[PDB]
From a paper:
The key determinant of host specificity is the envelope-located trimeric spike (S) glycoprotein, which can be further cleaved by host proteases into an N-terminal S1 subunit and a membrane-bound C-terminal S2 region. In the S1 subunit, the receptor binding domain (RBD, also called the C terminal domain, CTD) is localized in the C-terminal region, spanning ∼200 amino acids, and structural studies have revealed that the RBD consists of two subdomains: the core and external subdomains. For both MERS-CoV and SARS-CoV S proteins, the S2 subunit is mainly composed of α-helices and forms the stem region of the S protein. Here we present high-resolution structures of the trimeric MERS-CoV and SARS-CoV S proteins in its pre-fusion conformation by single particle cryo-electron microscopy (cryo-EM).
To date, little is known about the structural and functional information of NTDs for the MERS-CoV or SARS-CoV S proteins, though its counterparts from other CoVs, such as mouse hepatitis virus (MHV) and bovine coronavirus (BCoV), act as receptor binding domains and their crystal structures have already been delineated. We also solved the crystal structure of the RBD-preceding N terminal domain (NTD, residues 18–353) in the S1 subunit at a resolution of 1.5 Å. Our crystal and cryo-EM structures show that MERS-CoV and SARS-CoV NTDs fold into galectin-like structures as in BCoV, MHV and HKU1CoV. However, the glycan-binding site on the top of MERS-CoV NTD is occupied by a short helix and the N-linked glycan on that helix, and thus NTD in this conformation maybe unable to attach the cell surface by recognizing certain sugar molecules, unlike BCoV and HKU1. By contrast, the NTD domain is observed with strong and clear density, forming a stable triangular platform on the top of the S trimer. The flexible RBD regions are located on the triangular edges between the NTD domains. Since the RBD is located between the NTD domains, a strategy to develop neutralizing antibodies, which target the NTD and interfering with receptor binding through steric hindrance should be feasible in the future.
Numbering used by the authors: 18 to 350
Amino acid sequence: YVDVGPDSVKSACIEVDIQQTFFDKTWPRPIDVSKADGIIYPQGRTYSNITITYQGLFPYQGDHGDMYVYSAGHATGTTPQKLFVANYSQDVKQFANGFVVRIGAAANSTGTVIISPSTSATIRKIYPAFMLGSSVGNFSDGKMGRFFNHTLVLLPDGCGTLLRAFYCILEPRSGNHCPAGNSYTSFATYHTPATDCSDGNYNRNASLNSFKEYFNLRNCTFMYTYNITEDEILEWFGITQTAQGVHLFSSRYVDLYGGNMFQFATLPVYDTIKYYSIIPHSIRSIQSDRKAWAAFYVYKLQPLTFLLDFSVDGYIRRAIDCGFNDLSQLHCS
Ligand SMILES: *[C@@H]1O[C@H](CO)[C@@H](O[C@@H]2O[C@H](CO)[C@@H](O)[C@H](O)[C@H]2NC(C)=O)[C@H](O)[C@H]1NC(C)=O
Ligand SMILES: *[C@@H]1O[C@H](CO)[C@@H](O[C@@H]2O[C@H](CO)[C@@H](O)[C@H](O)[C@H]2NC(C)=O)[C@H](O)[C@H]1NC(C)=O
């Protein structure tokens, strides 16, 4: 097994305030395949200046997906206090064929800081975190969201400059507010921008450390890191699984400005992923440092036949979901 660094030496966890009503917003960003939203590129052949019909894993036209939002935590003028999160940890979803994720879409626009609805701020991109596995159930106090045996965790870190992917048994810790302790509400991750995101010295383990407060990582078969360049550009992330393992997709490395997703990793996870949840993150800012963080959107994948329009340079800038209606069907034919 892999050394993933020391266990947390903390005797308690940070208290977590779950307030789902603050995260219930209607900010629709439905799939528009005309603009090639949510498209994993059919890698393997050379396509250029051509229109084809292709059956693969796609989200459906007009799917609103599931929206998730991360918020600044409670704070006084000087001191971060309780984390502030939605009820995401108890909402375990079926993995099925996997999913794609629209990330950072609202970046640059003006939006509410969530925990203080009357306060607006410029929206910044934030990366999603996921917990995935083969077996789920409840924690000791009865709350849902516990993943058993080896669990895949995808956790961004370093103020959005890396992604960590690791596959470990998650042993719930027993201090106050921890998942095997008293006064448990939800687990979460956090970082503390004042100390973790100072210029030139980003803390590349902040979120991982926060996670290690709620769970001891045991028998990790791997822990990989992927560096990310800092920007506010819209991006797409995807995840699927085959007998070869778990496949991660991103628009970042191959189509940063266009959004087409290409595979960047295959993780040696051969036990079938059946379940996932979104890991809530809360940003331990002080009141005067509060920002708004871009909602992200998760859309389930399914086998569908699309018309794909490949440009001269090889990218897909237009698609049709053939089964959407008879008109689309006709156009595909
Ligand atoms: C920060 O996280 C990294 C993982 O990204 C930890 O890296 C491990 O560090 C130990 C030494 O402490 C090495 O023996 C392992 O080989 C490292 N693992 C990997 C996957 O790189 C690191 O320990 C963490 N740092 C702190 C201070 O906790
Ligand atoms: C937010 O604004 C930034 C800055 O203008 C945008 O970043 C640019 O994105 C375009 C592609 O859309 C690139 O060609 C530029 O090189 C980027 N500039 C920098 C300085 O990174 C960003 O796209 C905007 N985000 C959203 C969601 O609109």
